[PDB]
Symmetry: C3
Subunit: 264 residues, 3 copies
């Protein structure tokens, strides 16, 4: 039942003190906790980007983790904060605005509460920063031995707002998916096409804003010459496009939501 590791995500940036003031509040409540950032460089207000960044956090982090996350343009409104215990035994705290959707896909909710108890908040709560005074504060209380049931009333899992996620499908001559996100440090393109779908089938890849490439399917970057394009399964088990030691989206610009079709 111990949760001494707090994994922390927001959209407030890492460039000023704000993300650190949250950690100050958390160390004051849970002075023995380990606090590690996931990132604070989610694009402003971008709940979907935050949700995508959290997707693989449950799997990589141990059971004694509190996932503390906010992207909270609804701060100071009726949009509540929730605290969840997942099937892995981790705790998650965040706004009920879809942010935790893909982390919960990875490890479903077992018990879910609205955070309404003043005793798990940093008082007085400032309306424009529930992320510090409710989300961070509550996560730290959970790390410091507070029972999940003490944060507020139980809700059903279906009361957690979920962001829709497009799945790739078999079409009439291949697999139709889309760009989910860019691997931005490198310029690699990540799709929603899972391992099991490319199983069936060099491949033709059609990128719609329209470009057709004939690409080798490789296990890794070094299997083609430097600067050459490849298809590969990324670290997350989904089909990706890259140039070996270059930047694919600088050569073929593509944004999230663009269609990607793969055929023999």
């Amino acid at each position: 039942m111990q949760h001494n590791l707090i994994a922390f995500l927001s959209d407030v940036g890492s460039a000023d003190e704000a993300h650190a003031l949250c950690k100050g509040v958390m160390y004051g409540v849970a002075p023995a906790a380990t606090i590690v950032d996931i990132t604070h460089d989610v694009a402003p207000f971008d709940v979907r980007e935050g949700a995508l960044f959290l997707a693989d956090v449950p799997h990589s982090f141990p059971a004694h983790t509190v996932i503390c996350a906010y992207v909270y343009p609804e701060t100071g409104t009726a949009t509540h904060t929730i605290a969840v215990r997942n099937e892995k035994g981790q705790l998650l705290v965040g706004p009920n605005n879809g942010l935790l959707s893909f982390a919960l896909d990875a490890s479903p909710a077992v018990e879910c509460h609205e955070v309404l108890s003043p005793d798990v908040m940093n008082q007085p709560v400032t309306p424009t920063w529930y992320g510090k005074d409710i989300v961070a504060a509550c996560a730290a209380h959970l790390a410091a031995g507070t029972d999940l049931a003490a944060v507020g009333p139980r809700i059903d899992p279906k009361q957690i707002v979920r962001l829709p996620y497009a799945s790739a499908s078999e079409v009439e001559g291949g697999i139709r998916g889309e760009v989910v996100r860019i691997d931005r440090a490198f310029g690699n393109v990540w799709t929603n096409i899972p391992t099991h779908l490319i199983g069936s089938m060099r491949l033709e890849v059609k990128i719609e804003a329209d470009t057709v490439l004939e690409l080798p399917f490789c296990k890794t970057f070094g299997e083609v010459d430097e600067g050459q394009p490849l298809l590969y399964l990324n670290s997350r088990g989904r089909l990706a496009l890259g140039l070996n030691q270059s930047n694919f989206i600088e050569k073929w610009p593509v944004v999230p939501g663009d269609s990607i079709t793969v055929s023999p």
Copy 2:
């Protein structure tokens, strides 16, 4: 005890430099927790660093060593100081005004110049007192060195302070200025405190190379206006701020620190 070190500088987080300081600190105080405030203070910008530190004493617990350096005077006669504040925290930094606003929040009770070689990383490199004096001294304090071992007592009046303009009641409203931009979002932060905005949609007059006059609703939070619409609100630091709901105010209406802001009834 002071086993939590909160660390700020202007050396950036993009290369190893900020981490070499943590290596020195972990060597001296291997049981300390080190947490960054930020290393992305603009280069040489002591005032920006001072503003970023202002609310650190209130948010961090009493067992914190606030370790901060923006030190273009490194290797000169500008000394490093170590301070114990009214909250019981310790602060270490260049006596160049960097700690000024943190000390406004929680005044100095005890002040020393850091002159003892035994709290430094020897030999001290002239271009990086931040590592070899500031960071090293903070770690010795985290490891339980008495504040008196760092060097001699000085009067708190010898702590260099940065000037800070106050807002005031003027003919028919409140006149202040822009203190900083909430840069992740483009929100505008003023020096107008909650207590002055009590008597009084409001007229907001921004004076820069051109004047921008807006009629804005006073809201508790962003979602009280439509997406893209402007609002006046009290920020998380208790001061009047301007923003657009889920958009960037300064991208629409450019404003920089030092610009005048008046708020008056419609």
Copy 3:
């Protein structure tokens, strides 16, 4: 014992990737302290990563595991290595030259290839050996795994080394080059060590520098504040090598210079 993990990569700090590695490491070594060096090494730039690691052994205590990857060879025959240095630290990284300059600072005493599946995060994903081999193995070492259990011993000469030339005395001067930019400030760092400029300094301490990319006549100073704001200076940087800067301004914004550009210094 090695309870402190110092972590470097090229995956950036802007998304979750660097943190997923920390999650794996905390799972394996729950009592370890993890501190980033940086994740903002330029993509695939092994030499930049090697330069960022050069001064890590000296600054970090003996109980450190230096965990580093810049690994465009991930999923190939380029193995991960684990090394014990003369300071008693452990280092884990791709055998692609990344650890070269850290090993210059504190040489390898024992070296192994990381091949044992029991020090990896299974199943190992081919495009991220940095998570599933480098980070996982560093965590196992921090948790107390013996260095010899990671895989077979190799000779130090089997560690790939990136070439680095220090400057030399030529007819009447020092011929060096730009190694890296102090990018937060725009200061220029050369390969000219302390002992070479020492030999050439006279009373008044003024030098000529020729940049091939400009001739400047510059004062040799201890620190920035010795000349007026905006004025140029030569100085020995924090790492013991000659540098160029403007006091409280950006030298490379005025005089653009990139790594490998010649810098000649004469009386």
